[PDB]
Amino acid sequence: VNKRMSMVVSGLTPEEFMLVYKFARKHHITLTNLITEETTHVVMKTDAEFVCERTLKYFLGIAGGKWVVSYFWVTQSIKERKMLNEHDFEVRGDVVNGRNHQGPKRARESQDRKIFRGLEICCYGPFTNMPTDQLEWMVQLCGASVVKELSSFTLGTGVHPIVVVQPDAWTEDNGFHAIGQMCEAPVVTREWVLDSVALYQCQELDTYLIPQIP
């Protein structure tokens, strides 16, 4: 048996989804609303130069080295009544990290050398607009080791511990500045992960570091 096509779409209005659903129906393509290991294609809404917004399905698509292509692949197939090749429609960048950083392409080409290789990452809550277990899954797909609690860090010279938090999500407390007192590990924002994934290249922590209290 061979792997089969399984799609999720992102950034589309319902009406656009319905057009794809009719599309998926005609050419017997599997189409789900939730992305899994079995999902092979991620279809993003882009501009004429194949630049999209950064969504959860966008990040997870890259993390899994899956094919991330533009919505224009569907509309063009309609226009010419054929099934043209998706690869021609791979998104080249996004509105945050660059219009032609070739992240998704590079992501496919480096699964033997994943960007978070040799790292132990703890996603220290809370989080907004992105479930914790999905973010944990994200770094897993990128070769990182997920750590549930701060005390669970491996102690060793070879281990590289990292604490990732989202300052926006904290509303009741200013607690993220005190984490350095509880453990021996760098503390950086969620944006470190997002940028690293989008470019599929491990960014320097310097700019993403969150100031601590000694």
Partner: peptide, 9 residues
């Protein structure tokens, strides 16, 4: 009816 927009970052 309502369309929760997909969360964008």
């Amino acid at each position: 009816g309502e369309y929760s927009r997909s969360p964008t970052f």
